[PDB]
Symmetry: C2
Subunit: 303 residues, 2 copies
């Protein structure tokens, strides 16, 4: 028993991390099948980042301006291409350690494991969620750009995130591996507004089911509610609206526990209105929204 | 920002095997032609109520230990019991053996757990050895033989092997020489963990981490002494702070310009007044699962 914020094992992704240098700037790249993916801002100086014209900056570069290192070993770049905000560096040798992989664009509220890297070297692994405002609350210091986020379904690594930017507020922004930003953000050093963050309601409910499964049951109350009634309370506390899709996703957890989804929503409502009154749930004094329903099931089933 | 961060698990992934003996299956650690696993792999459910491990091990031969590493079967050519671990000598050295050590850690130290089922990696998370020598992990039925480790760099220091869930739902285990952390035994019986306490030095480190990240509301106008603070500490079931702990916080004191005893005065006020519904680094309670080395490392980017 017990319940932990757990990352996927990182070994498959460790073998894909390289260093990418271009003039002054050094950061991380992802080496799969003779292509190296990294943030296009590797071509920028500090001054460039204030207002980059990426086409004009990339024109001053050739293949030989991109230094790609894996351990001690240099890779020869034989091709460079810009796809949205990622650079694709075609190299002469396929990564012998390429895993089975996909590129996925995830939805707000989905979770993934980050492997935080500096100079192409793994530092650490942690789990986080794409927030409803398309930011993440990671841990990323100055050389961490090009660090990747991923899920493993089994054997296959689904890469969903590449780190690009820290906002002035100290939250993080980045792309999928086709180089499209999650959210409204751009790879420019300017004031950029993250919108209102909201809590991922379906995840909170999943985590409450996780609590019940692990014996934490005090918050099960005597009430029920409707979907509209609950969502009325949800909007007041900046919780995401719960839909029938979300009720369907919670079904297995409902079945395992014998606690109906709308009964669990009634419990959540009371916690919203009354707080936790100095108690904890799974050792947390706040409501956790970083577990999906699939994460809870997986952890409890032992995927 | 600031996150509970595990070590990358790749080096340890290549050491995980499945060990089967009669009915029971669990995880083992393959280094240099030896497989380490929990000796309770030889037990049935009935045996676990009152095991005589010597007498149970006598009924076993090398061929009764099925060791699988991925698809590859390993031939066992030797078995021995060291404390509560079984050492299975196999015919092949693990080609993926990393540089490694076996370390017995102190209460309050942290490590990364790679949770494994049937010799396969499930997931990685960071936790702390509690002052009462338990941990609050995530461990389901086949998780025994899962390991805890630190990486200093290139070298993997194995500190923990999972053996037991207690009736209270906390976890217990050994070092890699098979000695239990704490008073526990590998027997399905009522076993008392003592009073758990908070790891004071870790809380202070995490407050320094907070200040570094811009969370500063809890900085107050007081100072205190070591004995005065420890008087408050014992009331709240916090570990006593010593000069060793003050010395280890020195670099964080230097970085922030907040003297250690000034930070202890802040903590005292949080202890006495609670948090008044506020948060620090996104936690509404005091976090004791980061060491001083962990905070520095995360902030420096090792």
């Amino acid at each position: 028993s017990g319940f932990r914020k757990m990352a996927f094992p990182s070994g498959k992704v460790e073998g894909c991390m390289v260093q990418v240098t271009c003039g002054t700037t050094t950061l991380n790249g992802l080496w799969l099948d003779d292509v190296v993916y990294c943030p296009r801002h590797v071509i920028c100086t500090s001054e460039d980042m204030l207002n980059p014209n990426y086409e004009d900056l990339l024109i001053r570069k050739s293949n030989h301006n991109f230094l790609v290192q894996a351990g001690n070993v240099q890779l020869r770049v034989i091709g460079h291409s810009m796809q949205n905000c990622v650079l694709k560096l075609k190299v002469d040798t396929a990564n012998p350690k390429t895993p089975k992989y996909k590129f996925v664009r995830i939805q707000p509220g989905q979770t993934f494991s980050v492997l935080a890297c500096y100079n192409g070297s793994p530092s650490g692994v942690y789990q986080c969620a794409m927030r409803p405002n398309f930011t993440i609350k990671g841990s990323f210091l100055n050389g961490s750009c090009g660090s990747v986020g991923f899920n493993i379904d089994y054997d296959c690594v689904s890469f969903c995130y590449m780190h690009h930017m820290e906002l002035p507020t100290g939250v993080h922004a980045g792309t999928d591996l086709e180089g499209n930003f999650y959210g409204p953000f751009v790879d420019r050093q300017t004031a950029q507004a993250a919108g209102t963050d909201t809590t991922i309601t379906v995840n909170v409910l999943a985590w409450l089911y996780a609590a019940v499964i692990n014996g934490d049951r005090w918050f099960l109350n005597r009430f029920t509610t409707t979907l509209n009634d609950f969502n009325l309370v949800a909007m007041k506390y900046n919780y995401e609206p719960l839909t029938q899709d979300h009720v369907d996703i919670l079904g297995p957890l409902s079945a395992q526990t014998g606690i109906a989804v709308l009964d669990m929503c009634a419990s959540l409502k009371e916690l919203l209105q009354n707080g936790m009154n100095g108690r904890t749930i799974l050792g947390s004094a706040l409501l956790e929204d970083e577990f999906t329903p699939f994460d809870v099931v997986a952890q409890c089933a032992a995927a």
